[PDB]
Amino acid sequence: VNRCIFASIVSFPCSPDAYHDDGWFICNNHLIKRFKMSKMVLPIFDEDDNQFKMTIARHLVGNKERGIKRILIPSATNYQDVFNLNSMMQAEQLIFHLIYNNENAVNTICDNLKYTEGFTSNTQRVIHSVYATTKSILDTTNPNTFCSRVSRDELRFFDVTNARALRGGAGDQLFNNYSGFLQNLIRRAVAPEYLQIDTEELRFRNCATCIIDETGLVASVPDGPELYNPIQPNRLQIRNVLKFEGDTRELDRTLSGYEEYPTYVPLFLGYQIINSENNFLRNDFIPRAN
Amino acid sequence: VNRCIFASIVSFPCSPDAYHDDGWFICNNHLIKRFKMSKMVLPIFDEDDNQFKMTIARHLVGNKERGIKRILIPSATNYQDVFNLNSMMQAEQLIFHLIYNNENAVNTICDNLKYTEGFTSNTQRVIHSVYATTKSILDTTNPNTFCSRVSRDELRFFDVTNARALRGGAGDQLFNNYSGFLQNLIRRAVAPEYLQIDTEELRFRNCATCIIDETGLVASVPDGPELYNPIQPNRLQIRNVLKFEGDTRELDRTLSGYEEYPTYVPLFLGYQIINSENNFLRNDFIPRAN
Amino acid sequence: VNRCIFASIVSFDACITYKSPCSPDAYHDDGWFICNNHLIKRFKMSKMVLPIFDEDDNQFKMTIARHLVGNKERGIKRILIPSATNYQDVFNLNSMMQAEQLIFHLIYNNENAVNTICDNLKYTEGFTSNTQRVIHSVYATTKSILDTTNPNTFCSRVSRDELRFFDVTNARALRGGAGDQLFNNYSGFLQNLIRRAVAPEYLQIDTEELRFRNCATCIIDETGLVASVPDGPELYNPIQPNRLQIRNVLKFEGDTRELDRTLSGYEEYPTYVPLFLGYQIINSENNFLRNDFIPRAN
Amino acid sequence: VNRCIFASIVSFPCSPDAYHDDGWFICNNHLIKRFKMSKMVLPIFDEDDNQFKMTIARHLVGNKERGIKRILIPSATNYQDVFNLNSMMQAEQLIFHLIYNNENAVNTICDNLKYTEGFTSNTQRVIHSVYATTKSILDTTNPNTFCSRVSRDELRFFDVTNARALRGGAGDQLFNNYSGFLQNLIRRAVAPEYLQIDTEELRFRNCATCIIDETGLVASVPDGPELYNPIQPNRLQIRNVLKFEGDTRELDRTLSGYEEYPTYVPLFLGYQIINSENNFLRNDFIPRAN
Ligand SMILES: [Zn+2]
Ligand SMILES: [Zn+2]
Ligand SMILES: [Zn+2]
C-alpha cells in the first residue's frame, strides 16, 4: 500500500518503512531527504521487564549549521525558503503545498500545467492521482475531517511552563496552526520530555533538544551552543567536515565489548499527559487531537 | 590479569570485561553492585566514518529514589553512610577504605583481625595480598606516585561556568579531594558535556545529568524532577516497581524495524579541553591528572 | 651522503632506535640541505623545481617551494619559517625529539637553549657512554651543514654574483628593505632555505627583467616567513600517531566522473601555491651555472 | 562531430580535441593559432583527494609585446586591427565575422563571392554550408535563443570591486556586449580569482593576470611590468628570442627529480558565484549566461 506521503512521485526511492503501519506516513529515506529527520523508536521500559515503544526521530542538523539550516519542519509561512521547492520535482512541490495547506500554490501548480499540450493526454490523470493520494493521506492524518476517528486520550503540550495545568503556551498555540499531517509528524518525531501516564510522571530527558517558534520546529537547543551531530547527481555541494587524524584501531579494539551509547540528537520537547481511560496501545492510527 | 580493584575480594564475582584493559580498573558487575553504574562507550563519529571511543557510565538510580540513594560515588566524608560497609565482606571494607584513603578505618580493620587465632597463618598473607593488589591499582590510578606518567594533556573540568577560561568551580575543587582511583572512575564514567578538541568545541549533551556535591557524585539533574531510569539471597527487599499494564505485542511488532534509541540515563557533566599536542589515542591508561 | 639537516636525527637513548624518516631525494646535492619529508613536516613546504625555460627549448631550472598551509589557517599557523624571536612558540619544541630540539636551537643560533639541552642530559648515567658520542655526532653534522651554509665561515665561498632582495620597493637601486634587514637577521641555513624556497617576483638577469609572478604569495615579517598574501583573503591551498587533532576537512560531494572524463588529454595546470617574493638581481659576471653549493650572501 | 568553430574550412589541422565535447568549441592548436591561448585543466582540489576539472587557458603573449599584441580576445570594435583576419583564408575571415556578429562584413563577403563565375555553380553550397555550420555552433553557444537551455545558477563577474555584492562593474558591463561564443570563450578560458561555491569562497590567484577593457581581454597585469612568458607560409620572421647562453645541461640533472612548477601565465580575472542549486558536473554545455 506504501503509506508514505511522497510515494506518489512520478514525472509529469521509498524505503521499506513506508509499508509498515507506523503512523508516520513517511519513510526514513524520504524523512532524511526532506525534513532532516531519521525515524527511530523510544523503548519506554518498565522496572519489570515490560515495555512499550514510542516513536522518536533524531535531527540531522550539524553543529556548525546555523539559521534556516537548523529548521526541521518550517512553519506554513516560511516553508518555501527552507525547502527550496523549485529544485524539487513539480510533484514534490505540489505535495509540499498540500502538506502545508497552501491552496494558492496548488492552484498555480495546476494552472501552469494547463498550457502544456499533453495536460489532457494522461498528464491530468497523473496530476489528479497524485493529488488524490496526497489528500487521502492528509485526511487520514487530519482530525478535522468529516466523521474522523479522533483520540482525546493523550494531551501533548510543547510548552512545559504550564503543561501540568492541562494547558499550553505560545509553542502549543503555534502548533495548532499546523496541518494535520505536520501535526502528526511533529507528534511522532518529537518525543515528550515528560510523559504523564495516569498519575505517574516520567521524565526522559533533562532539557529539550528542539524548540517551536515562528520559524517552525527548530533543531536548536534552548540555550548555549548546539549539540555536535555527526553526519542529487551532478550537483556540486561543498561541506565542511570534521575529521580525526589519529589512529583509532587500538582504541576500538580495547573498548569493543561495552555497549555503545548513540551520539545522535533525539528530538525531545514538551509534555504528554496520557489519560487513565486511554487506548494508547492500539495499532490502528486513530489521529490524535490535543 | 583481572584488573579489577574488587577482584581481590575473598573470605578471610567479576565479569569478563574486568580482564580487558579498559582503564576503569573495575568490572561492570562490581560497578553495578557498588557505584550504581554500568560501563558503556560513547562512539564519537566524524562527519566522515572515522571514529574514536570514549568511556561513559549510565547511572542505575531510579526516579523515585531520593537522598543518599542517588549518590553514585560518595565523598570521603559520607561514604560510610552511603555504602553501609558493615554488610559487605571485611576484604571489601578494606578495599573501600583504601579507595577513600581512610587510614584510621584501615588500621582498625587490621587491628580487629590480629586477635583471631588464624591471623598468623593463611590469613595475614591473604590480607596483605589484597592490600598489595589494591595499592598497586591505586598507584596505577594515582598521579602522585613516585615516578607517575601524569598527563597535563587533557584539562577535565567539572564546572562549565569558567571552564573555557581554564578555571574551575566549587565542584572541581571538591573533585580534587578524591583519591586517584575515584578520580579515574569519575573521569571514565562522567562524560564531558563539551569536548573542546583544540579550538573545536563539541557539545555532547544539552544539560548535565549529574552534579558533584559535598555528598559526592550525585545522580540528580540540576533542576526539575529526576530522570526516568527503569531498572544477598536471604535479604528481603521491596522495590515498588512501576508496572506497565497493557498488551504491547502488537505495537512492538508494528515498530520492529526501526533502530531503538536507548532509554538509559548516562553521566554527562563538565568540560573537557584536549590540548593541541595530545596522546589521546593510547591504551596504556596513564593517570592523566588535571 | 644524505645531506639533509634532519638526517642526523636519532634517539639520544640507545634503547630506542629511531630511523630518520628521510625522503630518497635528500641524497641529492641540490642545495636545499633538507629532505622533502622534513620540509613537509617542519617549515611546511614541498620541495619543487621551477624550470625557467629560455625562449627556445633549452632551459635552466630553479628551486622553489609550495607552502602547504591552508586557507582557514590564521595567525601562528600561517608562519612557515618563523623568526628567531618566536620560533619556540611556533614550533612547540617540547613535543619534538631532543635531537630535533638541538637542531632547531642550532638553526636559530640559540646558544642558551643548546647549552640547556646538554645540561638536562648531563645528569643521566647514560650520558657518559653511548650518548655523548651520539649528541656530539648530531652537533658535528648540524654544525658542518650550517658552516657549509654560513657565509661567515673561515674561508667561505661567499658569492656576490647574484643579489637576492626580499623588498621590492627600491630593489632596482640595489637597496634593501625592512624585510631584507629582517632576512639578514636569520642564520645561514635559514637564509639558504628561504632563498631556495622563495623565488623573486622580478628576476633581473643582466638588465633583462623577468617578472616571474604578478603578486607575491609570501611576505617576510617580524613573525618570520609568513605564508600570507599582502592583501585580501588567503589563497586556497588544499591539503604523528596516537594524537587526536581536528581537521575541518572541506569535501566535494559531486560525481565528478563525467567532468573528469570530458577533458582527457589536456595538460593540468597545478593548483599548488609556490613562494614568490623579492627581486633577484643577477650580475653580468655571474656564475649561476655552477652545481657546487655556495652560501650566496649579499 | 568536429564541434570546433573553424572546423568547416574549405576554399570557397585541428588537434584531436575537436571530437571531444568539452564545451570549448575550439581546438588547442586552433586556440593557439587564433586567440593566443591554450587548453589546460585547472583541477580545483579539496582537503579530501577529490576534484572537479575546471578549465584554464595560459596566454601566449610574450614579455616584450605591447599594445594590440597583448590582447587575447579583442572587442567587437577593434578585431580588424588586432587579428588581421584578412590575411587568413576567406573561410576563417567569414567565421570570425560570424563570431563577432558583424553582418556588414558577412554580407560584403557574400557580395564579393557573388560576382565569381562559380557562385551559381557549386560555391554557394560551400559558403552557406560554412555560414550555417558556424551560426549553428554560435547559437549552441549563444544563451539567448528561442529555446534556451541556459543555466542561471552561476554568476560570473570580471570586476571584483563589488562582486561579493552580486554586482559587477565596468569590466562586466563591457563583457555583456560580447557575442555568445566570445562570452563562452572568456568564461571557459579565464578562471575566476574567487570561486564562491554556496557560502564558501575559494581564492586561486592573488592578482588578475588579464584585465578587461575597451580593447578586449588584455594579457597585461594591472600593475608593474608585464609577465615573463617563454614560448603564414613563406613569411620570414623578424623574431627576437631571449639569450640564455649558460651551460644549464647538468644543473637540470641536479634538479631532475623534483616536481616542476609550470611558468605558464594563467588567465585569472574576476569573481564567480555558484549557488547551492547547481548542475556544474553535467556535460551538456549549459550556455551559462549571467
Ligand atoms: Zn516514501
Ligand atoms: Zn570486579
Ligand atoms: Zn630528511
Side-chain angles (χ1 to χ4, degrees), chain C residues 30 47 49 51 54-55 59 61 211 213 215-216 229 231 233 235-236 250 260 263 266-267 269 271 291, chain D residues 22 40-41 43 45-46 53 55 203 206-207 223 225 228 231 239 242 244 248 250 258-261 263:
Chain C
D30 48 9
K47 303 170 39 212
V49 55
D54 197 356
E55 218 292 324
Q59 58 271 83
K61 309 174 69 162
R211 183 166 190 178
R213 220 178 189 74
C215 298
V229 300
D231 302 295
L235 283 151
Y236 172 65
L250 209 78
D260 284 13
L263 316 93
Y266 307 164
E267 169 190 7
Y269 192 65
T271 319
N291 52 73
Chain D
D22 39 357
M40 269 196 325
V41 160
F45 277 105
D46 61 298
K53 281 191 193 172
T55 319
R203 170 191 236 190
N206 283 353
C207 291
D223 60 292
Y228 177 57
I231 316 104
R239 214 242 177 164
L242 222 63
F244 288 168
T248 77
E250 183 264 358
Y258 301 130
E259 201 254 354
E260 284 135 2
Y261 188 80
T263 324

Side-chain angles (χ1 to χ4, degrees), chain B residues 2 4 6-7 13-15 18 26-27 30:
Chain B
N2 194 315
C4 191
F6 289 115
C14 269
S15 34
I26 186 159
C27 73
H30 279 111

Side-chain angles (χ1 to χ4, degrees), chain B residues 242-255:
Chain B
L242 200 68
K243 197 183 155 191
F244 283 162
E245 299 157 3
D247 201 6
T248 87
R249 320 175 311 249
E250 35 205 1
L251 203 51
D252 292 9
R253 197 165 191 186
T254 285
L255 303 169

